[model samples]
Target: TANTASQQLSLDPKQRSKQILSNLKKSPPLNLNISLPTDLTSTDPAKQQAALFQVIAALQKHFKTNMENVNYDLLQKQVKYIMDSNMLNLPQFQHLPQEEKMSAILAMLNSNSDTALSVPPHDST
Candidate 1:
C-alpha cells in the first residue's frame, strides 16, 4: 500500500495534523498544558495507545515548526520526566539521532501507554 502506518516517518506531517487538531479541538486547546490526559488512562488498551499516538505524533509533527517554543518544553520535560527513572537515559536523549530515539519511544509507549503516563507539567515563564 502507498500509505502504511508502520512506515512511521510517513507520520510527522500532513495527515497527522488534522487527526490531532480534531482531538485537541474536542477538548481544551491549551493542550500545551496537556500533561495528564484523561483518555490516556484506561481499562481499555485501544483508546490508550490512541492517546499516546496523538501525543507523540503531535510532538513529531509540530516539533519542527515550533522549534523555538516547544517540542522544546516537551522534549525538555521529556528528558526530565524520565530524569527520575535513571540519569544515564537523559544523556541518551541528548545524543541519539531522531529516528532511533523516536523508534524506541513508540515501542515503549505502544506497551507502556497502558501505564496512563502522567508525568509532570512543563510550563511557566
Candidate 2:
C-alpha cells in the first residue's frame, strides 16, 4: 500500500487533477475567503505531508496547454472556491520543484475539460 500511496503522492499531473475533483465531490463544503495561494502555506509537518498528497494528485490529472481553454472567470471562481475551502495545505507542493508550481496551478484551473472529466456519479448500490 505504501507503493500505491507513494505513487499517488507523485501522481502525474493529469491523474492528480482527476483525484482532486474526485476528492472535492466527497468532501464536506469548505469555508471561503482565503486565497488559494495563501491557503497553500503550511507550518505543521503532518499538514505538509497531507498537502503533498493533494499536489501530487493535482499533477496527475492536469494538462499545461489546457490553460488556454479555461474561462478566466471560472478559473478565478475556482481558485477562490479552493481558497474558501479547507483543502489548501499540500505536502506535494512543498516538495514540488519551483518550476512545476505554475503548471500545477494551471492543471487545477484547466481541469474542467470534458476529455476526462466524467467522474462517475456516486452510486448507492
Candidate 3:
C-alpha cells in the first residue's frame, strides 16, 4: 500500500494536468468573480481564507483516478506566464470584457503550436 501511495504521489506534470482538467470539466461552475480575487493577497484574513478554501475545494474534488497531489503548481505557472508576458499588462486589457480577455489569454497560451501547451512544474516548496 505504501508503494502504491508513493507512486500516486509522483505523478508527472502532464498526467497531473490531465487529471485536473478532467475534474474541472465535471465541477459545478465556479464563481470566479467572487472566489478568485484579482489580487490574490488580501489583508482580510477571513476573506482570504475563505477564498483560498474555495480554490482548494475545487481542485481537491474526488476524481475517477485517485491521486495524492493535485498538480496546481503547473497550472498556476501557466497563468502566471500568460499574465507576465506583457500582453495582458496593456492598459486596454483592463477595459476588455471578461469573456474577451479570457479568449485573448487562451489564444496566446495556445498559440505556440497546434498541439496542447506544455505546463512546466514549479517547486512548491
Candidate 4:
C-alpha cells in the first residue's frame, strides 16, 4: 500500500519550450518569473501600477534612502526620472500611473546597479 496524496502538477519544460519556440510570434518567453506584476503592457493597468507600490516597500532597504520613506506623491516624479534615464521618453509620464515607473526601477536595480541611484547616509543632528 502507498499513500501519495500531496503535490501534483503538470509541467514539461521541453514541451513548453518547443511550443513557445515553435512559433516566434504570439509567445516569446515573457513573465521572467511568478513575481513582479509590474507589467506596462496588456491587462488591468490599474493593478499594474498598484503592485508598484510594493517595489518601494522592498527598494527602501535596498537604496536605504528616501526611495520609500519619501512621500508617495513626491516620489512619483522621481520614478519618472528613473524611467526617463531608462530612456522611456514619456511626455506626460507624471499623469500616468506608476506602472512602468517603480516596477521597472525595481527590475533595473535588481538586474543592474547602473541605475546610478546611490544611497545617502543617515543624518545625525
Candidate 5:
C-alpha cells in the first residue's frame, strides 16, 4: 500500500502530461456551477454598503503586507455622506445594542448630505 502511494506521488512531468491528456481523450471536459448569495445585490442601501465594507475587509486581510505603505484621501463627498448619515457620532454608540449598531450607523450617515463637505481643492499635489 505504501509502495503504491509512493509510486502515485512521484509521477514524472512528461508522464503526468500524457496521463492527463489520455484522461481528457477518455472523457468530456469539466463544467462548474456556482450559486451566489442574494445579499451580494440586495436592494437595501445598508445591505449594499455592507457588501462594500466586506470587500474592504477582505482586501485589507489579503494584502496586509502590501497595504502598509498605502496612503490616500477620502473624497469630500464621501466624508459628507458619512456626516449626513449621522454615523460619526461615536459617543452615542456605547448605549446601542450590538445588532442595532449597523442600522443606526447607516441611518445616521445617510441622514446628511454634501452641504458642509464641498470644499474646492487648491491643487493636484
Candidate 6:
C-alpha cells in the first residue's frame, strides 16, 4: 500500500509513535495498539519489557528514526496503555507471553481499516 503522511512519517519510529499519539487522542478505538497501558507487569518483567522495547526498536530500525521523538502526549498515552489494561487483565500474562501483547499493540498501532480511509475531510467546500 502507498504510504500516507502518517506511514511516511513513520519512516521514523519516534514520528510514527507521535502520529499514533495524535490519532489516539482524537478518537481512539478499543483495538488500536500504539497507546498501550504501560504499568501492567508480567512474571518476566524483563522479557515483556524487552519485547516491547524490541517492538519499538524494530519500528525504529525499520523507520530509521529514534523512538524518542514521540511527543509527550503521545508517549504518555501509549505508556499508559502499556501499564494499564493489557498487563492487568490478561491471563498468565506475566510469563513473558509474547503473542497476545504483540497482537494488542499491533492492533492498537495498525488497526486502521478501509473504513477510516474515506474522503470526507477532503471536501471542505
Best by lDDT: 2
Candidate 4 per-residue C-alpha lDDT over 1-125 given as tens digits, one digit per residue, 9 for 90 to 100: 99878644325422232232223233223222223443532145455444444544445445664444634653454444333343223333323345433333444333223333433457889
Residue 118 lDDT (model 4): 36
TM-score per prediction, in order, is: 0.27, 0.31, 0.33, 0.33, 0.24, 0.32
On TM-score, the candidate that comes out on top is 3
Total clashes, candidate 3?
0
Supply the TM-score for candidate 2.
Answer: 0.31
The candidates, ranked best first by TM-score, are: 3, 4, 6, 2, 1, 5
> How does each model score on lDDT?
0.37, 0.41, 0.39, 0.39, 0.35, 0.40
Two-way lDDT contest, 2 vs 4, winner: 2
Q: Candidate 4, clashing residue pairs?
A: none
* Model 3, TM vs. native: 0.33
Q: Model 4 residue 15 lDDT?
A: 29
TM-score, prediction 1: 0.27
Model 2 misses residue 25 by how many Å? 24
Off by over 4 Å in 4: 1-35, 38-42, 65-70, 81-118, 122-125
| Candidate 4 lDDT (Cα, 0 to 1) | 0.39
Q: Pairs clashing in candidate 1?
A: none
| Tens-digit per-residue lDDT, 56-115, candidate 5 | 333223333334422123323433343333332333442454334333333332223532
lDDT of 3: 0.39
Clash count of each predicted structure: 0, 24, 0, 0, 8, 21
The digit string of per-residue lDDT tens for model 6 on 64-100 reads 3434342333333444445443443444333323434
